[PDB]
Each structure stands twice: as C-alpha cells, then as structure tokens.
Design an enzyme around this catalytic site. Structure first.
Site, PDB file in Angstrom:
ATOM      1  N   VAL A  15       0.602  -1.260   0.192  1.00 39.85           N
ATOM      2  CA  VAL A  15       0.143  -0.157  -0.482  1.00 39.85           C
ATOM      3  C   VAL A  15       0.764   0.995  -0.127  1.00 39.85           C
ATOM      4  O   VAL A  15       0.273   2.060  -0.520  1.00 39.85           O
ATOM      5  CB  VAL A  15      -1.137   0.037   1.306  1.00 39.85           C
ATOM      6  CG1 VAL A  15      -1.881  -0.869   1.017  1.00 39.85           C
ATOM      7  CG2 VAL A  15      -0.698   0.129   2.459  1.00 39.85           C
ATOM      8  N   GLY A  16       1.859   1.054   0.383  1.00 40.40           N
ATOM      9  CA  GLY A  16       3.324   2.686   0.712  1.00 40.40           C
ATOM     10  C   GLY A  16       4.433   2.096   1.553  1.00 40.40           C
ATOM     11  O   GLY A  16       4.715   0.410   0.890  1.00 40.40           O
ATOM     12  N   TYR A  20      11.424   3.049   7.058  1.00 38.89           N
ATOM     13  CA  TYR A  20      12.146   1.757   6.350  1.00 38.89           C
ATOM     14  C   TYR A  20      10.923   0.859   6.256  1.00 38.89           C
ATOM     15  O   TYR A  20       9.443   1.063   7.189  1.00 38.89           O
ATOM     16  CB  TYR A  20      12.726   1.568   7.453  1.00 38.89           C
ATOM     17  CG  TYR A  20      13.929  -0.161   7.227  1.00 38.89           C
ATOM     18  CD1 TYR A  20      15.022   0.213   6.996  1.00 38.89           C
ATOM     19  CD2 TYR A  20      13.099  -1.329   7.872  1.00 38.89           C
ATOM     20  CE1 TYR A  20      15.705  -0.642   6.636  1.00 38.89           C
ATOM     21  CE2 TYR A  20      13.872  -1.865   7.812  1.00 38.89           C
ATOM     22  CZ  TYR A  20      15.150  -2.878   7.014  1.00 38.89           C
ATOM     23  OH  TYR A  20      15.359  -3.415   7.241  1.00 38.89           O
ATOM     24  N   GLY A  21      11.580  -0.329   5.953  1.00 35.14           N
ATOM     25  CA  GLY A  21      10.156  -0.554   5.900  1.00 35.14           C
ATOM     26  C   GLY A  21       9.393  -0.558   4.716  1.00 35.14           C
ATOM     27  O   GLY A  21       8.907   0.113   3.717  1.00 35.14           O
ATOM     28  N   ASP A 133       6.421  12.583  12.868  1.00 36.12           N
ATOM     29  CA  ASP A 133       6.669  12.094  11.808  1.00 36.12           C
ATOM     30  C   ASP A 133       5.429  12.461  11.061  1.00 36.12           C
ATOM     31  O   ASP A 133       4.245  11.520  10.185  1.00 36.12           O
ATOM     32  CB  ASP A 133       7.030  11.462  11.222  1.00 36.12           C
ATOM     33  CG  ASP A 133       7.524  10.497   9.886  1.00 36.12           C
ATOM     34  OD1 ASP A 133       7.295  12.584   9.074  1.00 36.12           O
ATOM     35  OD2 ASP A 133       7.771   9.933   9.407  1.00 36.12           O
TER      36      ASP A 133
HETATM   37  C1  LIG Z   1      -4.154   2.086   2.097  1.00 37.36           C
HETATM   38  N1  LIG Z   1      -3.959   2.521   3.626  1.00 37.36           N
HETATM   39  C2  LIG Z   1      -2.195   2.409   4.096  1.00 37.36           C
HETATM   40  O1  LIG Z   1      -2.072   3.558   2.615  1.00 37.36           O
HETATM   41  C3  LIG Z   1      -1.549   2.660   4.659  1.00 37.36           C
HETATM   42  C4  LIG Z   1      -1.972   2.688   6.304  1.00 37.36           C
HETATM   43  C5  LIG Z   1      -2.898   1.544   6.776  1.00 37.36           C
HETATM   44  N2  LIG Z   1      -3.166   1.280   8.884  1.00 37.36           N
HETATM   45  O2  LIG Z   1      -3.772   1.565   6.515  1.00 37.36           O
HETATM   46  N3  LIG Z   1      -0.900   2.614   7.121  1.00 37.36           N
HETATM   47  C6  LIG Z   1       0.213   3.233   6.253  1.00 37.36           C
HETATM   48  N4  LIG Z   1      -0.472   3.490   5.267  1.00 37.36           N
HETATM   49  C7  LIG Z   1       0.735   4.243   4.169  1.00 37.36           C
HETATM   50  C8  LIG Z   1       1.857   3.674   4.095  1.00 37.36           C
HETATM   51  C9  LIG Z   1       2.285   4.744   4.759  1.00 37.36           C
HETATM   52  C10 LIG Z   1       0.876   4.806   4.744  1.00 37.36           C
HETATM   53  C11 LIG Z   1       2.570   4.248   6.669  1.00 37.36           C
HETATM   54  C12 LIG Z   1       3.455   4.276   7.404  1.00 37.36           C
HETATM   55  C13 LIG Z   1       3.589   3.633   8.125  1.00 37.36           C
HETATM   56  C14 LIG Z   1       2.796   3.427   9.561  1.00 37.36           C
HETATM   57  C15 LIG Z   1       2.757   2.562  10.491  1.00 37.36           C
HETATM   58  C16 LIG Z   1       3.260   2.279  11.311  1.00 37.36           C
HETATM   59  C17 LIG Z   1       2.244   1.686  12.696  1.00 37.36           C
HETATM   60  C18 LIG Z   1       3.679   1.981  13.463  1.00 37.36           C
HETATM   61  C19 LIG Z   1       3.387  -0.447  12.708  1.00 37.36           C
HETATM   62  C20 LIG Z   1       1.350   2.417  14.124  1.00 37.36           C
HETATM   63  N5  LIG Z   1       1.129   3.318  13.329  1.00 37.36           N
HETATM   64  C21 LIG Z   1       0.123   3.708  14.554  1.00 37.36           C
HETATM   65  C22 LIG Z   1      -0.510   1.775  15.096  1.00 37.36           C
HETATM   66  C23 LIG Z   1      -0.975   1.467  16.228  1.00 37.36           C
HETATM   67  O3  LIG Z   1       0.868   1.036  14.748  1.00 37.36           O
HETATM   68  C24 LIG Z   1       1.543   2.582   8.587  1.00 37.36           C
HETATM   69  C25 LIG Z   1       1.413   3.690   6.905  1.00 37.36           C
END
Ligand SMILES: CNC(=O)c1c(C(N)=O)nc2n1[C@H]1C[C@H](C1)c1ccc(C#CC(C)(C)c3ncc(C)o3)cc1-2
Length: 291
Positions: A15-16, A20-21, A133
């Site tokens: 998804v993105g 890192y990662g 961030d």
């Molecule tokens: C369609 N969804 C996404 O694109 C989506 C989703 C999501 N949760 O759906 N999450 C992300 N994305 C994009 C990649 C980048 C933004 C991105 C980048 C980093 C993260 C993250 C993270 C962690 C540390 C696991 C987190 N955050 C909140 C908690 C409880 O744990 C998540 C995402």
C-alpha cells in the site's frame, strides 16, 4: 515471545512505504478482515528494543484519531517484524489532494481534517508522546471518512547502537526548525510543539497539493527550514481564519508557538458550522475516486 503470523495474518499487496520497510494491505485469515501491516527486516539483537516499542504502540493507539494497534509477529527466515494495525482503506491525505481537481481541498475540508489531526495529537501529547513525523502521508482516511494518524514515534531511550529500521531519515519538508541541528541549535530535539508546525505544513499541503520548498532537493530544504521565515499560503482566496491558523501552527520560534489545546480553540478549528456536510462530501469523494 512473538509468534509466526502463518494462519493468523497474510499479506495481500503493498500500500506504501514508511521511513524503513514496506506497508501492506493484510488480511486476518480466520475473519477475512483487512489490516495494515508494516513489514521490516530485523536482526535477533533488535528483539529487546522492539518489545519496548510494542508496549508504546499498544498503550497510546486507543483513540479514534489514531490507527488501532492489533498485534506484532516475527516471520522467521534476516527475520521479518510484522506490525499489525487497523486498515484505513481510503488512503492518505497526500493521495486525497493528488486525486482532486486542481490539487486543492475546500477550506472546510482542511478545517475538519486539521482538527482530527490535532485531536489525535492532543491524545499523544497528554501521554508525553511526540508523533515526530506528521505529514499528509501519515494522515489516513477510512471508508467512512474517519481521520487517523499513523507511524507515531516509539524509538530511542536505550543509548544502544540504533537498529537498521531507525537509521533512515525521511522527508524533511514537514520538519519544524527546532528539530534540525545547526550551529545555534547543536542539540535539536523534538518538543510537542514540533508536531504543530508539521500540522501547519500539512494544511498548506491540503491547500496547494504540496508542502513549501517542494521544488528543492531534500538536503537543500533541510538547510533552509531553520533560516527561512514562516511559510505562507500563495493564494489570497483563503479566509482570514485559515491564514491565522497557518500563522499559529507555523510560529518560527517553538517557545511562542501555541499548544495543541490552544490550537484546538482557534476559530478555524473550533468554529465548523458545515461539519455534517463536510463528512458527507468526503465520503462521496472517497467512493467517486474508488471507482
Ligand atoms: C491504504 N492504507 C495505507 O496506505 C496505510 C496504512 C493503513 N493503516 O491502512 N498504514 C500506512 N499506510 C500508508 C503507507 C504509509 C502510509 C504508512 C507508514 C507507516 C505506518 C505505520 C505504523 C505503525 C508504527 C505500525 C503504527 N501506526 C499506528 C500504530 C498503532 O502502529 C503505516 C502506514
């Protein structure tokens, strides 16, 4: 103590990316429910630090403006750490602006999204947690236009050799001046108010489709942020309340920058009459873009 995700969660597609990662669209095997999974290569010595990061994620994700923590897993091979959270299907606010005609959002939409960011930040700040961030990429939308923050800082404090997943510097464009170390600021540290500057840059991004200094090399932008005066919206079409909100977010010296609670009481955030229709307008835009 972290089990293998086999038969619990499965990765569907990317998804993105984080700093890192990679972040995947994932699925809970037994229910079919989606989840977002942050997959990062980790060594066996990083294990103690990761467990401390887990407890931080678990503790402060219990708020409607912060993506919910589900669980952590280690896929043995370096090994893979899987951080499972709530899936926000409608993607980032960066995608939202990019997929809108003229790459600009309506002022009442900016007011609604910014307040939701501020509410998520208020929850983190009251618990002595700095996000570190805030940017359009880390502000997500669900299918029912709910706003959720992702990737709040859970690192440091151990004085150790920083693990590979924490050795990367992301994008500088949403960074507050005080966070960038220079001759007059040798120990540049994050303050809770650093997130408020980032929130202000995110509102310019919603208004113009890009943060200020987007035309520059990231290293050049890093040098200019501490030297340049507060950024401004290019257009004059915006209301007096919106210009005043940006001004508050973007007070150059963090020492006179308002708190999250003060900014939540700003007329641009506090006075939202068309709140009900904005959520409907966003939901309708989510469905229109989906198909
Ligand atoms: C369609 N969804 C996404 O694109 C989506 C989703 C999501 N949760 O759906 N999450 C992300 N994305 C994009 C990649 C980048 C933004 C991105 C980048 C980093 C993260 C993250 C993270 C962690 C540390 C696991 C987190 N955050 C909140 C908690 C409880 O744990 C998540 C995402």
């Amino acid at each position: 103590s972290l089990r293998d995700p086999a038969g619990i969660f499965e990765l569907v597609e990317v998804v993105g990316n984080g700093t890192y990662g990679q972040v995947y669209k994932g699925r809970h095997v037994k229910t079919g429910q989606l989840a977002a999974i942050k997959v990062m290569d980790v060594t066996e010595d990083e294990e103690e630090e990761i467990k401390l990061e887990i407890n931080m994620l678990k503790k402060y994700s219990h708020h409607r403006n912060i993506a919910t923590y589900y669980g952590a897993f280690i896929k043995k091979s370096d090994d893979q750490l899987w951080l499972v959270m709530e899936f926000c299907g409608a993607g980032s606010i960066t995608d939202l602006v990019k997929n809108t005609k003229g790459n600009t959002l309506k002022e009442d939409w900016i007011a609604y999204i910014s307040r939701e960011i501020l509410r998520g930040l208020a929850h983190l700040h009251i618990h002595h947690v700095i996000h570190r961030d805030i940017k359009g990429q880390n502000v997500l939308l669900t299918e029912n236009a709910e706003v959720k923050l992702v990737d709040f800082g859970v690192s440091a404090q151990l004085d150790r050799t920083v693990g590979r997943r924490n050795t990367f510097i992301g994008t500088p464009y949403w960074m507050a001046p005080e966070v960038i170390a220079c001759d007059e600021n040798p120990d540049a540290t994050y303050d809770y108010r650093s997130d408020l500057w980032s929130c202000g840059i995110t509102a310019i991004e919603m208004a113009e489709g890009a943060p200020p200094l987007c035309d520059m090399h990231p290293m050049r932008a890093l040098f200019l942020i501490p030297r340049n005066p507060p950024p401004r919206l290019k257009s004059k079409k915006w209301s007096k309340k919106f210009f005043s909100f940006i001004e508050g977010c973007l007070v150059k010296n963090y020492m006179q920058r308002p708190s999250t609670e003060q900014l939540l009481k700003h007329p641009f955030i506090r006075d939202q009459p068309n709140e009900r229709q904005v959520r409907i307008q966003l939901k309708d835009h989510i469905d229109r873009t989906r198909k």
